[PDB]
Amino acid sequence: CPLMVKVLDAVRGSPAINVAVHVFRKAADDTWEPFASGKTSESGELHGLTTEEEFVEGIYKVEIDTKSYWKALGISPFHEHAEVVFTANDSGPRRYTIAALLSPYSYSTTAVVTN
Amino acid sequence: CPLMVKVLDAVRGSPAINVAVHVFRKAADDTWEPFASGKTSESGELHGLTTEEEFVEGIYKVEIDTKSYWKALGISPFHEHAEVVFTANDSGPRRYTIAALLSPYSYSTTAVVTNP
Amino acid sequence: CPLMVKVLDAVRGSPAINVAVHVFRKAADDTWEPFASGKTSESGELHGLTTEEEFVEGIYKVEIDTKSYWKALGISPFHEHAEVVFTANDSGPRRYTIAALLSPYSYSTTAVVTNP
Amino acid sequence: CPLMVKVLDAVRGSPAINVAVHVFRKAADDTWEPFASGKTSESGELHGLTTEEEFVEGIYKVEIDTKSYWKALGISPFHEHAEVVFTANDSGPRRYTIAALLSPYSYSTTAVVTN
Ligand SMILES: [Cl-]
Ligand SMILES: [Cl-]
Ligand SMILES: [Cl-]
Ligand SMILES: [Cl-]
Ligand SMILES: [Cl-]
Ligand SMILES: [Cl-]
Ligand SMILES: [Cl-]
Ligand SMILES: [Cl-]
Ligand SMILES: [Cl-]
Ligand SMILES: [Cl-]
Ligand SMILES: [Cl-]
Ligand SMILES: [Cl-]
């Protein structure tokens, strides 16, 4: 598993569960093409998005549907979604974890890249 | 000034100067249309992007060119750019400050929204 | 003003108003001595804590009373307070801004240090 | 394991390895008494700090020695250490994870409290 996503809720101090995540890959014509998607588990994690063979170097966008998450909790959010855009590089280590910490009017995201 | 941006560098503990910022607005055909652009000043702030008149209700995307910033400093970062997407002025005109805190493999962004 | 504090509320997207702040300085006997205190204003800022003369080199602890803030709003948070501990003025006098971003189960703090 | 610590490095995009962590419990006389300590693993984690029996309700301080961490990497840091102070409450869920994200002049910490 070369690409993982982990999402936390800073208001409840818990994993952000059942959050929709969509991954896109940048195509030759500068358009974003759907690549993989899923919903975070009870542990706020999403595994099995893609495979080593499929995850080639290139520019990727990870869209985290935070607006719907906050709505389902009856909390008014600011962002439409959280966006993480990065280049996958074979030179760098091989396992990518995109971590995100959510607040209604703030979020942080971190990339944990390891071997 | 209804739309301001402020950027800090978490590695140096200073404002992030000369950071390029591009703002887009979602058009009727659902594509992103260029709305405004600029660069942060010595204080890490970017003012004068737009005016109350031009800043109508809509979905806006604020793109902060973090890669170019880190590269202009001999650092190779993870993200291409920080992307902040939000609906603006749906409850009437508001003043928005988009704050960002940058690290090479991480960033946070916060919105401060007030009513004049 | 060599030591300022700014606090934002990440739940409301606004400044965190009337947040109590206590500053301590490490004394010769290695105990924390009260140095200065105040509360953030409507802009979430706390100025006038100290003066250039009184703000000597040392190890300072800035305590931000986040629990009292969240409780004063009918919210039950995780942390007692945010604690920011740092050496100040070891390379000559500097101006420090301690920024904090608050959520009920999370906070971030950033130092912006400049030279006048 | 009711109390865990996880630390990430925002400059390198990796777990923060070999970081010293000291936990204190607040005593009747308002003084902080050593409670548990250790060093983060290769995964930036520290488990086995305490046990269910030992971890009673009370006020705790988790000190993360970030200054030394940055020094060992040849990077000039701002803080002496990161401090996390909180009350352990039996009413709330039972497993506490104190997460911290480190930058030289910034840090965030999050509490993930689950069952
Ligand atoms: Cl959108
Ligand atoms: Cl993060
Ligand atoms: Cl991780
Ligand atoms: Cl791109
Ligand atoms: Cl931010
Ligand atoms: Cl602000
Ligand atoms: Cl305390
Ligand atoms: Cl902060
Ligand atoms: Cl600042
Ligand atoms: Cl100390
Ligand atoms: Cl955190
Ligand atoms: Cl976690």
DSSP A50-97: --TTT--SEEEEEEE-HHHHHHHTT---SEEEEEEEEEE-TTS-SEEE
Contact C63, C52 (CB under 8 A): no
CA C5 to chain centre: 5
Contact C67, C81 (CB under 8 A): yes
Task: Give the integer Cα–Cα distance in Å for D22 and A108.
Answer: 26
Structural domain of C31: 1-116
- A67 Rama sector, left if φ>0, alpha if ψ -120 to 50, beta otherwise: alpha
Token pair in block for residue A77: 């959010």
Cβ C114–B14 below 8 Å, yes or no? yes
Nearest to C10 among A12, A13, A105 (CB): A105
Whether chain A has a CB inside 8 Å of the CB on D110: the answer is: yes
Task: Give the integer Cα–Cα distance in Å for C1 and C4.
Answer: 7
Residue type for position B107: Y
Nearest to B101 among D9, D104, D106 (CB): D106
Residue whose token pair is 């971590």: A99
Is residue C45 marked as binding?
A: yes
Q: How far is CA C7 from CA B94, C44, C64, D16, in A?
A: 20, 5, 9, 27
The C-alpha R_g of chain A, in whole angstroms, comes to 14
Nearest residue in chain A measured CA to CA from B103: A110
Task: Give the integer Cα–Cα distance in Å for D47 and D63.
Answer: 15
Helix (H) or strand (E) holding C71: helix C66-71
Q: How far is B21 from chain D (nearest CA, A)?
A: 22
Neighbours of A43 (CB within 10 A): 14
Task: Give the integer Cα–Cα distance in Å for D96 and D112.
Answer: 6
Neighbours of A82 (CB within 10 A): 26
Resolution in angstroms comes to 1.9
Handedness of CA A61, A47, A70, A34 (dihedral sign): positive
Q: Which residues contact B2 (CB under 8 A, 6 or more apart)?
A: B50, B51, B52, B55, B93, B94, B95, B96
Domain CATH number, residue D77? 2.60.40.180
Contact A83, B85 (CB under 8 A): yes
Q: How far is C65 from chain D (nearest CA, A)?
A: 11
Whether chain B has a CB inside 8 Å of the CB on A51: the answer is: no
Mutation site for A-interface testing, chosen from B70, B83, B97 by largest number of A Cβ within 10 Å? B83
For residue B94, what is the DSSP state? -
Task: Give the integer Cα–Cα distance in Å for B109 and B107.
Answer: 7
Q: Which residues of D touch C108 (CB under 8 A)?
A: 101, 106-109
Cβ B8–C108 below 8 Å, yes or no? no
3-state SS, residue A14: strand
Token pair in block for residue C105: 């189960």
Q: Which residues of D touch B101 (CB under 8 A)?
A: 106
Cα A100 to ligand 2 centroid, rounded to whole Å: 4
Domain count, chain A: 1
Token pair in block for residue A37: 């998607």
- What's the half-sphere exposure (Cβ side, CA atoms, 13 Å) at C75? 20
Q: What method did the depositors use to determine the structure?
A: X-ray
Contact D107, D86 (CB under 8 A): no
Contact B15, B42 (CB under 8 A): yes
Q: How many residues are recorded in chain C?
A: 116
In DSSP terms, D19 is beta-bridged to: none
Neighbours of A36 (CB within 10 A): 20
Which residue from B92, B90, B67 is spatially nearest to B79, judged by alpha carbons?
A: B67
Strands in chain D per DSSP E? 3-9, 14-15, 20-26, 32-39, 45-46, 58-64, 79-88, 95-103, 106-114
In DSSP terms, A102 is beta-bridged to: A9, A107
Residue whose token pair is 């809509």: B58
In DSSP terms, A15 is beta-bridged to: A8
Task: Give the integer Cα–Cα distance in Å for B97 and A40.
Answer: 30
What burial letters (b/e) apply to D41-57, b meaning 16+ CB within 10 Å? eeebbbeebbeeeebee
3-state SS, residue D70: helix
Task: Give the integer Cα–Cα distance in Å for B103 and C78.
Answer: 26
Q: Which residues contact B70 (CB under 8 A, 6 or more apart)?
A: B76, B77, B102, B104
Task: Give the integer Cα–Cα distance in Å for C46 and B56.
Answer: 34
Is residue B108 marked as binding?
A: yes
Whether chain A has a CB inside 8 Å of the CB on B91: the answer is: no
Q: Which residues contact A44 (CB under 8 A, 6 or more apart)?
A: A6, A7, A8, A9, A14, A15, A16, A17, A19
Token pair in block for residue D52: 């269910």
CA D45 to chain centre: 10
Which residue from A4, A113, A94 is spatially nearest to A49, judged by alpha carbons?
A: A4
Token pair in block for residue A61: 């966008």
Task: Report the alpha-carbon angle C22-C24-C27, nearest 5.
Answer: 165
